[PDB]
């Protein structure tokens, strides 16, 4: 086990990559504070964990609301005594819309969830970890944190911004035992990409060196490693899980 | 003359890098729409342009307000008939504050000006330029768009976000006559920077391979070149003007 | 056990990072072909592996000689029957010498070992792995594959070259069952580094966000993970183990 | 004029991007030392320059031979008194060959010309510039200095290596007034790409945001700017001229 005895929080854990991250953290021996804006999906992730003999609680949060992060910290300390690990996993892309046609609401919503929500989490997490001797934070960025993808200017800006805030936090808090890294998935086999046409999926697949999409466990495995004491010299860094996407 | 007969917009043109960009645009023959949140400062840059025989007007805009960008486009159209070039110069980093102590207001203000304001500007500028055959946009990022600087998490996030949205927009509009690139200054001898102790400047200087700080004209020269038809194969890219800061 | 039943080759395995990589591979259950230019050092690493109950052999190779790579493949095939994993660990930077004073012999030696030797190894390893269904290759680069370090132009060139050839090979062989990635250590507490003055180490330490040097096990842990089936969506990519060095 | 009164050397100047660089340097007012391994092509470039009223000489060099660089320096000092500017422009890709099939001679030849030849030039140039108060060096890298291109492992490694050696030289010599930068062209309309099929050229074109190939003047214009006093805060940096290639 990678994470025996450690307490981990995961945001956006009711579905997709966040759900797998939560399940993997618990399989690696972590106590997990599952969070999602959906109570139904969040509680289902919790039930998944408990059904496999893991230790977890569910706490609702809208990560775009600063105040909800304090409730997350509170839940961790109350259930498990300390926060060792946090994963800021978040929103989706939004709809594909050219920049000239992108509305204020699209820009604001994507920025809110995928960038501001990460800052608010990271700020609360740091505070908590500083009390119990440090810890490890992983921010889920994207390949869109390194390259651009047409139609999703807001997400690209957000995901780049996550890569940046990882860098400055690493230097601000490295002395004090907080590691922080970003993870950059490419296209992963989750709901949204499952609903598009075989032709479009083949097109996406062909943008990867491995010529397939990734699985959520392939991302989670990385996240779990970066969250572990095996990663103790790893901070301020972007870790792709991109099947070679960025390499061409 | 790199820019004879062109019409350029410069945001944050009231002082520092943005003032010099505006002057250098006029010196290279462009008509200039001077913008700034401060009307007094914006009017001053206009006065310096006009003093040398340049053609310019001033138009107030709060670039954090989406609607004010329409007034800038309109001013360009009213004074000179079209928009050929835009430089989104944006602002400053705010006070150095570690992430765990950075307030909601700090985060929201710096994001709003240095990231959202650039998106609202790029959006408006694309729309305008598409009416008359295209043009060139230069976004001023920072070294902070590529590395972290302790104490300015919000600015680092924003400036990384700027590098990302440049990439997307370049692919979205590359066939439609629009080039867009980002510029990454390091520490530049502005009035703000001038006042810090010879010791602290000696510390900033030593972070550059040239072992000095840059001048605003060294930034503006690059911006002018990137805005010109000499740069006709240059798009989607980040151009440091950093005296070697990123190279170590 | 990340690597049960796998057979791994490690070059430059006689000491430092390469010795620890080899041990950690054996500890994770792989058979290990130990290689090094120094037979005494290579035999020592073999002895430490065998002492713990690991399965290993030693095979001399000068990795700068293309033909010696054939002897390494053959040793893997003779002792364990196939090659599943290879780590091209390569060497050291040589003496710090400014570019204008760097000799032909310095340039040619460092390029030969740290760049050409990696290409000859990757070439041989690809050929071998293609015979039995594929495998995983990890190239040890450096922070010097992403930034410059004064006095080691040849090493900087080589280590950047390693990051590049990783990218190409990943696309060339990604459909044929081969993953390849690069690892970028910063300054690591090897015997070489251990002997430098507490002052000079304090200067190297301060260049890392963790404000210390790394341990060879912190590098090897990453290498082992990247060599394993947990890393099944990871290819073409650079994975720092740099304690935050690149983040400023 | 950008370069009035300055003396510039260009390598690989008998054809393609190097020839255009030479012609542009001379149009910008520089005295030019044209160099190529082909005397015939080299002398034709010289005649082009002289026919437009420029000042230049031709000096043969094989840039893979260290000794030939001393002859280049000697020619500059003898004809024009000093070296202000140098452009290390070089070889070609070689044949497209998968890594497992690439021979020792292919790896050695491409590395020799595109990497070692750049180091040997840079080493000689530094020495010369240090005598007359510094200057500016531009290294022609490629998009292959940032990404991988299947079939050209040697060129990818070489072009990455050029990006790296630019970084360390910038820091070693920034104090002493030497600027050094790399330029990264994408696919440019030169002989080799002119001879491939419309279908293949359309495929290449489609890898650029501008959806066309670049022209040699678009590259030279950049090189000339980076070689000029307008670029005085620009060093250690990679400047794409890639039509947006790297941005996706
Ligand atoms: Mg790409
Ligand atoms: Mg740095």
């Amino acid at each position: 086990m990678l994470l025996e005895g450690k307490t981990a929080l995961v945001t956006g854990a009711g579905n997709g990559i966040g759900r797998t991250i939560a399940l993997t953290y618990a399989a690696e021996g972590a106590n997990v504070v599952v969070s999602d804006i959906s109570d139904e999906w969040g509680r289902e992730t919790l039930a998944l964990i408990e059904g496999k003999g893991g230790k977890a609680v569910f706490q609702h949060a809208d990560t775009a609301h600063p105040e909800d992060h304090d409730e997350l910290i509170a839940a961790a300390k109350r259930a498990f005594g300390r926060l060792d690990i946090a994963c800021n996993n978040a929103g989706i892309s939004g709809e594909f819309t050219p920049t000239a046609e992108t509305t204020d609401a699209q820009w604001q919503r994507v920025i809110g969830i995928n960038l501001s929500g990460v800052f608010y989490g990271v700020r609360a997490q740091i505070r908590a970890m500083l009390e119990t001797g440090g810890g490890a934070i992983v921010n889920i960025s994207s390949i869109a944190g390194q390259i651009g993808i047409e139609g999703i200017t807001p997400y690209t800006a957000a995901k780049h911004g996550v890569v940046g805030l990882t860098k400055t936090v690493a230097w601000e808090y490295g002395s004090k035992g907080i590691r922080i890294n970003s993870v950059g998935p490419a296209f992963i086999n989750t709901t949204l990409v499952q609903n598009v046409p075989l032709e479009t999926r083949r097109q996406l697949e062909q943008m990867h060196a491995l010529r397939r999409l990734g699985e959520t466990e392939e991302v989670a495995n990385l996240v779990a490693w970066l969250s572990s004491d095996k990663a103790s010299f790893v901070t301020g860094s972007y870790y792709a899980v991109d099947g070679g996407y960025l390499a061409r």
Side-chain angles (χ1 to χ4, degrees), chain A:
Chain A
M1 283 181 267
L2 284 171
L3 307 177
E4 185 164 23
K6 298 181 164 65
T7 299
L9 171 60
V10 187
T11 70
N15 73 99
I17 292 164
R19 165 172 284 180
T20 300
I21 293 167
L23 271 54
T24 302
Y25 279 173
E28 297 286 348
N31 309 308
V32 185
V33 176
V34 176
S35 181
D36 205 84
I37 194 162
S38 171
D39 290 19
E40 177 163 4
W41 302 126
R43 284 185 314 243
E44 183 171 68
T45 295
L46 172 66
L48 278 161
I49 292 176
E50 290 198 297
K52 298 173 212 219
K55 286 171 58 187
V57 296
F58 174 70
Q59 181 69 38
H60 182 269
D62 176 350
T63 65
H65 294 177
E67 58 267 16
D68 291 11
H69 291 282
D70 287 352
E71 298 171 352
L72 291 178
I73 301 323
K77 288 174 189 175
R78 184 164 66 243
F80 304 125
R82 67 184 276 166
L83 184 67
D84 297 302
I85 294 161
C87 183
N88 296 293
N89 169 79
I92 52 146
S93 57
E95 183 157 330
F96 286 60
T97 313
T99 299
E101 297 157 43
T102 301
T103 64
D104 298 348
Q106 290 170 286
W107 164 264
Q108 285 155 15
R109 174 156 176 81
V110 172
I111 294 297
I113 296 160
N114 286 286
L115 185 54
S116 298
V118 179
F119 165 75
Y120 300 136
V122 167
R123 179 178 63 184
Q125 286 150 26
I126 296 158
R127 302 159 163 171
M129 281 173 184
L130 282 188
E131 302 169 19
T132 52
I137 296 169
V138 179
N139 296 324
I140 307 304
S141 175
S142 176
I143 52 168
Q146 303 292 163
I147 50 64
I149 296 174
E150 293 184 60
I152 59 178
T153 281
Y155 186 84
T156 301
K159 292 300 198 176
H160 273 67
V162 171
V163 167
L165 72 79
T166 297
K167 297 170 189 171
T168 296
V169 172
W171 269 88
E172 291 177 351
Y173 300 93
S175 298
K176 293 185 285 276
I178 295 174
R179 297 187 304 91
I180 188 166
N181 298 283
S182 64
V183 166
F187 293 92
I188 308 300
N189 168 44
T190 60
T191 303
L192 282 179
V193 329
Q194 281 155 22
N195 295 332
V196 309
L198 175 62
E199 292 27 298
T200 299
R201 158 178 201 106
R202 282 286 186 252
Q203 289 174 331
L204 293 173
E205 290 171 343
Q206 290 321 293
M207 301 182 188
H208 310 75
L210 296 180
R211 313 285 182 152
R212 66 175 172 91
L213 305 201
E215 302 294 330
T216 66
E217 293 80 0
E218 299 179 303
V219 179
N221 289 337
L222 175 58
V223 172
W225 187 88
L226 278 173
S227 302
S228 84
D229 291 347
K230 303 282 175 197
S232 55
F233 202 61
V234 181
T235 194
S237 299
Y238 176 96
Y239 265 44
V241 53
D242 77 352
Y245 191 105
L246 297 173
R248 74 160 192 170

